[PDB]
């Protein structure tokens, strides 16, 4: 399963519900993720017709795979507000061309 293959890209699901993206999330999440290592800005995609705990996909690309691993381990099961976040990896090549709806 593709979400289990370690890469420098982390996918966060269930942060917020469908249509509930805001800029505060992206700013805070990038700051939080700098704890694991250098990281780019959040890249956000919402999947049409998805369940409320899957619709919003937040991607962050770390500079180093070790940081991404640390991020998956620390963020999976942590709370963002009241929501329990699901964290996994994402394929780098799919990410770079903005293919953001792959099964993980």
């Amino acid at each position: 399963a593709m979400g289990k293959c370690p890469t420098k890209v982390v996918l966060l699901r269930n942060m917020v519900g469908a249509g509930e993206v805001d800029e505060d999330l992206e700013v805070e999440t990038k700051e939080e993720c700098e704890k694991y290592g250098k990281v780019g800005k959040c890249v956000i995609f919402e999947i049409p017709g998805a369940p409320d705990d899957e619709a919003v996909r937040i991607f962050l690309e770390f500079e180093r795979v070790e940081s991404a691993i640390k991020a998956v381990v620390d963020l999976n099961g942590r709370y963002f507000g009241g929501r329990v976040v699901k964290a996994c990896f994402y394929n780098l090549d799919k990410f770079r061309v903005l293919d953001l709806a792959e099964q993980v």
Binding site: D24, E28, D74, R78, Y79, F80
Partner: peptide, 9 residues
Amino acid sequence: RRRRWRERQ
């Protein structure tokens, strides 16, 4: 800005 990430407990 809102702060929502919570520490693990």
